[PDB]
Design a protein around this ligand. Structure first.
Ligand SMILES: CC(C)CCC[C@@H](C)[C@H]1CC[C@H]2[C@@H]3CC=C4C[C@@H](OC(=O)CCC(=O)O)CC[C@]4(C)[C@H]3CC[C@]12C
Ligand SMILES: CC(C)CCC[C@@H](C)[C@H]1CC[C@H]2[C@@H]3CC=C4C[C@@H](OC(=O)CCC(=O)O)CC[C@]4(C)[C@H]3CC[C@]12C
Ligand SMILES: CC(C)CCC[C@@H](C)[C@H]1CC[C@H]2[C@@H]3CC=C4C[C@@H](OC(=O)CCC(=O)O)CC[C@]4(C)[C@H]3CC[C@]12C
Ligand SMILES: CC(C)CCC[C@@H](C)[C@H]1CC[C@H]2[C@@H]3CC=C4C[C@@H](OC(=O)CCC(=O)O)CC[C@]4(C)[C@H]3CC[C@]12C
Ligand SMILES: CCCCCCCCCCCCCCCC
Ligand SMILES: CCCCCCCCCCCCCC
Length: 596
């Protein structure tokens, strides 16, 4: 027993594996009786302070809670920062796109409806597949994290919980109409900003094991020790015993991390492909009013930064200090937060984490069910199958396109849990697959010299050129090609960078040769005023760029001279983390109540 505080663990090969905390009755009632319960609850109840809450609501997926801590268990303190740093980029790209949607195409319901107008019907069917693949990739990795936490904490069979989760979201979507309400989007941002405060104040303030920022420091300095022998009876391969490979001096408390720095690039490339190629973002930008409220997107983006930052800094750095025997596979599957929650407050932190996770799963898997349904009913039914009917049919074949997707996703989730895919491989592989269609979409709304064949070729060749590099680098640097060598940070960076850049270069070189000068006169008709929509854009591209350059660039640069953090500097980091996540938890729960 190397340490006196972790002696009941002596070393195991995994934290989980037997004697589940909860019983199957609790697990079979949460995956099936949460969407229905909230559907009845919302029907029981009949500004720039209510736009921030709705903005925060749809941006919280099941990966925000589970992967931010996965990249904090490795790399130390650079993980949560590099994960959360992609926050002002989204707000800038959402504002500057919601302005142009209102200015150049007011009567559209889907992104692929502005594609058939600008360009032809041959570049429509390519992006109609490149958009339907993103709704599959994102929906398939909140059924991978949801079905692993439930099986771990409770004991429900994972193949039987992968098929019952989508059916609890289909009921929630069908009930309450296939539309969003400002009342149901306010109760979702209240529950997730209460568990955040509870978990942050339990780790650095109150717990009888990890109680102060000066205990985490002394316990994270002892894990990375050069005199710690952990060959075969005192650790295993991927169990995080000693010095970190790639960190300055092997320390967890440093911002000089290379593995954590390349994940920032991967995260940036991956997050650009979900605000452009995902129709769920276009649906929620069409239904906004930038002219009336546009300062509510910055306040709804500066508060979301504290959710993956504070919670990860607590729940991922409190697992290293407690010496839990978490293996690498379990950490990948999304099992660090439930590992810390049982260790700190067992049988009661596990019910709080389940509620916080399934309040995000059910509220983010309903935004994809109404994004695939619209992309079907408005684009493959009333464009090509039957364009002469609009009465009572548009609704039937919109309600019937949710049930089909909720079953296809359920079957595909069963198929990918048998194989062995884990959020953590799908999260990193998103860019390699759908990054080639990002710039051909920005050029559609922002550039007046972009043609159709260039878009087709740039979208359809970048994917192949990215996958070839992604599968080649792993083969030439690791021997074989399987789920292990492919998920490394080497191949994935090459794949992401090739995919995003080649599809932009090919499209922007082939368009300066044969330009199509477009006045947007065809997208403006599909089915004062300009002064406000010109000052709003001026405000956004200034006050979003300032914060982007201030957070992504200046803040990490000034932390490099700190080298290994010293007691007193970690007290500053661990206090910024608590302050952001506390003063962000009042402006969401009390500001949209100063309506009075
Ligand atoms: C704005 C963010 C999202 C991206 C910023 C990009 C660059 C500023 C970063 C990204 C990857 C970084 C590199 C990641 C890894 C290394 C290896 C590292 O090599 C070593 O010193 C370790 C080698 C050894 O000692 O064996 C030197 C810095 C370098 C090139 C880093 C330099 C800074 C880079 C290029
Ligand atoms: C995990 C360890 C053991 C291996 C680490 C390997 C990486 C550090 C190397 C291997 C292959 C390299 C890549 C090979 C090819 C490219 C493509 C290149 O991108 C372009 O050429 C884009 C421009 C265009 O194609 O238009 C940028 C460098 C990059 C990502 C290289 C970056 C460094 C990589 C990822
Ligand atoms: C645009 C140009 C003109 C200025 C860019 C500013 C920064 C990007 C540079 C300027 C000084 C640099 C620092 C100069 C010295 C070091 C010490 C160096 O420490 C070591 O690794 C050596 C210590 C040891 O191994 O004993 C780490 C990088 C750092 C902080 C450098 C990080 C990058 C800094 C902040
Ligand atoms: C040559 C070796 C043996 C010694 C190297 C010492 C430097 C690495 C240290 C010593 C004093 C330090 C400086 C002490 C005070 C400042 C002022 C500070 O600037 C401000 O506060 C400007 C803002 C304002 O005053 O409004 C920025 C850091 C800096 C340059 C520090 C940078 C790092 C310095 C130069
Ligand atoms: C002692 C073992 C090797 C230590 C090498 C550490 C390299 C750290 C480089 C990563 C720093 C990138 C900062 C980027 C900020 C914009
Ligand atoms: C032991 C070797 C340490 C090397 C550290 C290199 C740090 C370079 C960071 C510079 C990034 C500047 C981005 C603008």
């Amino acid at each position: 027993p190397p340490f006196d505080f972790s002696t009941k663990y002596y070393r195991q090969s995994s934290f989980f594996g037997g004697t589940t905390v909860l019983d199957q009755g609790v697990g079979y009632a949460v995956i099936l009786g949460f969407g229905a319960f909230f559907a009845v609850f919302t029907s029981f109840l009949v500004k720039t302070g209510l736009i921030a809450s709705v903005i925060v609501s749809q941006w919280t997926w099941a990966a925000t809670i589970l992967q931010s801590s996965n990249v904090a268990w490795q790399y130390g303190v650079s993980g949560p920062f590099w994960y959360a740093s992609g926050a002002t980029i989204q707000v800038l790209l959402f504002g500057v796109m919601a302005i142009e949607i209102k200015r150049k195409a007011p009567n559209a319901h889907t992104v692929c409806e502005i594609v058939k107008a600008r360009w032809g019907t041959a570049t429509h069917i390519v992006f109609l597949v490149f958009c339907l693949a993103t709704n599959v990739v994102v929906t398939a990795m909140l059924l991978l994290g949801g079905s692993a936490v439930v099986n771990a904490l409770t004991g429900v069979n994972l193949y039987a919980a992968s098929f019952l989760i989508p059916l609890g979201v289909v009921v929630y979507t069908l009930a309450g109409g296939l539309k969003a309400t400002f009342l149901a989007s306010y109760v979702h941002s209240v529950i997730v900003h209460v568990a955040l405060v509870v978990f942050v104040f339990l780790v650095y303030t109150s717990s009888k094991e990890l109680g102060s920022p000066s205990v985490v420091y002394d316990r994270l300095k002892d894990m990375v020790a050069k005199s710690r022998s952990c060959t075969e009876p005192l650790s295993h391969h991927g169990q995080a015993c000693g010095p970190v490979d790639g960190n300055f001096r092997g320390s967890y408390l440093t911002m000089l991390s290379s593995g954590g720095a390349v994940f920032g690039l991967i995260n940036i490339v991956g997050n650009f492909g979900t605000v452009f190629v995902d129709n769920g973002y276009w649906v929620s930008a069409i239904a906004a009013r930038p002219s009336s409220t546009h300062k509510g997107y910055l306040l709804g983006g500066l508060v979301w930064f504290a959710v993956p930052f504070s919670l990860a800094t607590s729940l991922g750095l409190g697992a290293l200090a407690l010496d839990l025997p978490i293996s690498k596979d379990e950490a990948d599957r999304g099992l660090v937060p439930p590992a810390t929650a049982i260790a700190l407050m067992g049988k009661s932190g596990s019910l709080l984490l389940l509620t916080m996770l399934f309040m995000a799963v059910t509220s983010a898997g309903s935004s994809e069910l109404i994004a695939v349904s619209s992309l079907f009913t408005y684009d493959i039914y009333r464009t090509y199958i039957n364009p002469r009917a609009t009465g009572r049919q548009i609704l039937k074949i919109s309600r019937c396109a949710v049930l089909g997707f909720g079953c296809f996703m359920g079957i595909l989730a069963v198929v990918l849990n048998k194989a062995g895919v884990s959020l953590g491989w799908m999260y990193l592989a998103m860019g390699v697959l759908i990054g080639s269609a990002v710039i051909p979409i920005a050029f559609m709304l922002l550039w007046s010299k972009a043609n159709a064949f260039g878009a087709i070729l740039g979208a359809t060749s970048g994917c192949v050129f990215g996958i070839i590099t992604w599968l080649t680098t792993a083969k030439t640097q690791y021997g074989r090609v399987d789920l292990d060598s492919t998920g490394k940070n080497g191949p994935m960076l090459a794949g992401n960078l090739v995919a995003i850049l080649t599809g932009g270069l090919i499209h922007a070189v082939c368009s300066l040769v044969r330009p199509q000068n477009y006045d947007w006169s065809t997208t403006r008709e599909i089915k004062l005023r300009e002064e406000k929509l010109r000052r709003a854009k001026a405000w956004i591209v200034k006050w979003g760029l300032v914060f982007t350059i201030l957070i992504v660039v200046i803040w990490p640069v000034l932390s490099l001279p700190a080298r290994v953090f010293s007691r007193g500097y970690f007290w500053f980091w661990a206090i910024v983390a608590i302050a952001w996540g506390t003063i962000g938890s009042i402006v969401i729960i009390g500001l949209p109540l100063v309506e009075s």
